[PDB]
């Protein structure tokens, strides 16, 4: 596809504080491409943060060269093929000396400005918090939106509500976590309203 | 907000065989507005199908006057408020002899062309023709859960070794149901690959 060059992330309509599901493309020093789904937190007009688990090709590539592209797509097969295994050589395109996803609705180049270790606890792992600056922002005519799970978590909770015991509370809890993790104040307020109606 | 008029559903990039999550606005004889989330199956350039469970105001209104609008929004509080209770009067607007959702990114008028009663619960299958298609500048996409069903399945997949096979089995089963019901060939194929990978 053909890309139009834009100044920054506002052309992708990314909003400060939201986490976007994206395909992150990285490469080793032989320029062998790697792709994987990674959440990308928008922190400002031209900055993002990534939270990267240890021992993946994504983190090792990124810590080795400080470079990556973030790629917007809504194709479930790209998310699937880059999770179950590796994308084929032909899924990688060059842009200057960055690689990106062939056929991405939008991508931006990114350079690492800081990295920080971080203990994660849920249900203990150590992660890298990688803050980056966006360089060139490339948008195709096929771009519509960057994928965000906030609206989906509210929708799944409403559907569960319409059919409302331990599983339900559990579903509502997973969805609330997702909404707080990735969403904005409207999503979080939606979740509050739903939990309120469930308590009643 | 301002709308542009369009001929058919292609303007909203709805695809045949996909189910969209929308707000359906209906009204009684006194033109009292009702809004509720309803799935809308796109069946062609200007046709849709709705599946309407018994005993809602939505079905009562639609079977009574054979008219409604389908309204595109991604606002989580609108889905939430119209599920938990009722939208207030200022949430309805006029278009010709139809009501629509005030502030919708897009809406279309629809006229019932046939209805069929299905049998536990009673269900009405309502086929309708799309009339005027009205698109605002804020329009990006109509909401569809297919990509989210894949996304949820892939996260569950990456967490496979760390959770109990039973909840995992059930979550994949349910995301499979969603992709089947709402999704296109790519989402269905994605789910097929995921389930296969889990079985290996
Ligand atoms: C939708 C989704 C979101 C994900 N987000 C992250 C994330 O933000 N950070 C991370 O380290 N891994 C994340 N992952 C998991 C990685 O994609 C997964 O570990 C992948 O196998 C890494 O492969 P790699 O070794 O090629 O880098 C995510 C996976 C999915 C399916
Ligand atoms: C995301 C979502 C999709 C829904 N889809 C349908 C559907 O297609 N058909 C239906 O009968 N009800 C559907 N519902 C449930 C109704 O919205 C719900 O019963 C609502 O309370 C009806 O309100 P009413 O009495 O104003 O019509 C859906 C609910 C949600 C949250």
Q: Which two tokens stand for residue B63?
A: 């079977």
Residue to substitute from B35, B52, B80, interface A, most A β-carbons within 10 A: B80
B38 lines ligand 2 (CB under 6 A): yes
Q: Report how far ligand 2's centroid is from the alpha carbon of A176 (Å).
A: 21
DSSP H or E stretch at residue A171: helix A166-182
Domain A148-200 matching CATH 1.20.58.290: the answer reads: yes
Neighbours of B186 (CB within 10 A): 18
Looking at the CA of residue B50, tell me the nearest atom of ligand 2.
8
Q: Which residues of A touch B147 (CB under 8 A)?
A: 74, 76, 79, 147
Q: Which residues of B touch A162 (CB under 8 A)?
A: 83
Domain edges within chain B? 1-143, 144-200
CA distance B104 to B119: 33
A51 lines ligand 1 (CB under 6 A): yes
- Residue to probe by mutation, ligand 1, list B158, B159, B162, B190, most atoms within 8 Å of CB: B158
> Residues in chain A whose beta carbon is closer than 8 A to a beta carbon of chain B?
21, 37, 74-77, 79-81, 83-84, 144-145, 147, 149-152, 154-156, 158, 161-162, 183, 186-187, 189-190, 193-194, 197
Residue to substitute from B72, B76, B83, B148, interface A, most A β-carbons within 10 A: B76
Indicate the DSSP class of residue A11: G
Pairing state between β A92-95 and B19-27: unpaired
Select the residue of B76, B84, B186 nearest A151 (Cβ to Cβ).
B76
Residue of A nearest to B38 (CA): A159
CA distance A155 to B20: 12
Q: How was this structure determined?
A: X-ray
DSSP H or E stretch at residue A47: strand A47-53
Select the residue of A79, A152, A193 nearest B145 (Cβ to Cβ).
A152
Question: A6, exposed or middle or buried, with CB in 10 Å at 0-12, 13-18, 19+?
Answer: middle
Picking from A111, A51, A61, the residue whose alpha carbon sits closest to that of residue A86 is: A61
A58 lines ligand 1 (CB under 6 A): yes
Pick the CATH number of B1-143 from 3.50.50.60, 3.30.990.10, 2.40.10.340, 2.30.110.10: 2.30.110.10
CA distance B141 to B15: 11
Picking from B5, B77, B162, B49, the residue whose alpha carbon sits closest to that of residue A123 is: B162
Picking from A103, A16, A165, A155, the residue whose alpha carbon sits closest to that of residue B39 is: A155
> Residues in chain B whose beta carbon is closer than 8 A to a beta carbon of chain A?
21, 37, 74-77, 79-81, 83-84, 140-141, 143, 145-148, 150-151, 154, 157-158, 183, 186-187, 189-190, 193-194, 197
A110 φ, ψ to 5°?
-140, 140
Which superfamily, per CATH, for A1-147?
A: Electron Transport, Fmn-binding Protein; Chain A (2.30.110.10)
How near does any CA of chain B get to the CA of A31, in Å?
26
Per-position b or e across A41-78, b if 16+ CB within 10 A of its CB: bbbeebbbbbebeeeeebbebbeeeebbbbbbbbbbeb
- DSSP per residue, chain B: --EEEESSGGGGT--TT-EEEEEEEEE-TT--EEEEEEEEEE-SSSEEEEEEETT-HHHHHHHHHSEEEEEE---HHHHHHHHHS---GGGEEEETTEEEETT-SEEEEEEEEEEEEE----EEEEEEEEEEEEEETT----B-SHHHHHHHHHHHHHTGGGS-HHHHHHHHHHHHHHHHHH--HHHHHHHHHHHHHHH-
Cα–chain-centroid distance for residue B184? 14
Domain B144-200 matching CATH 1.20.58.290: the answer reads: yes
B1-143 matches B144-200 in fold: no
- Residue to probe by mutation, ligand 2, list B39, B110, B181, most atoms within 8 Å of CB: B39
Q: Which residues of B touch A75 (CB under 8 A)?
A: 186
Contact status, residue A36 vs residue A57, Cβ threshold 8 Å:
yes
Indicate the DSSP class of residue A45: S
């Amino acid at each position: 596809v053909e890309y139009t060059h834009f100044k920054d992330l506002q052309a992708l309509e990314m909003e400060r504080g939201r986490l976007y599901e994206t395909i992150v493309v990285t490469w080793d020093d032989s320029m062998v491409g790697n792709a994987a789904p990674i959440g990308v937190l928008c922190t400002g007009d031209d900055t993002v943060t990534l939270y990267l688990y240890q021992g993946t090709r994504t983190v090792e590539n990124v810590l080795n060269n400080g470079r990556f592209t973030v790629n917007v797509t809504l194709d479930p097969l790209i998310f699937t093929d880059s999770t179950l295994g590796d994308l084929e050589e032909d899924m990688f395109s060059h842009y200057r000396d960055f690689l990106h996803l062939r056929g991405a609705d939008a991508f931006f180049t990114a350079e690492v400005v800081s990295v920080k270790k971080l203990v994660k606890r849920d249900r203990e792992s150590e992660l890298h918090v990688v803050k980056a600056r966006a360089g060139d922002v490339m948008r195709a005519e096929s771009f519509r939106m960057a994928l965000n799970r906030g609206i989906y978590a509210v929708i799944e909770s409403l559907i569960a509500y319409t059919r409302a015991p331990l599983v339900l509370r559990e579903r509502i809890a997973e969805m609330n976590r997702v909404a707080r993790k990735v969403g904005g104040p409207r999503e979080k307020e939606a979740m509050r309203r739903i939990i309120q109606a469930l308590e009643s």
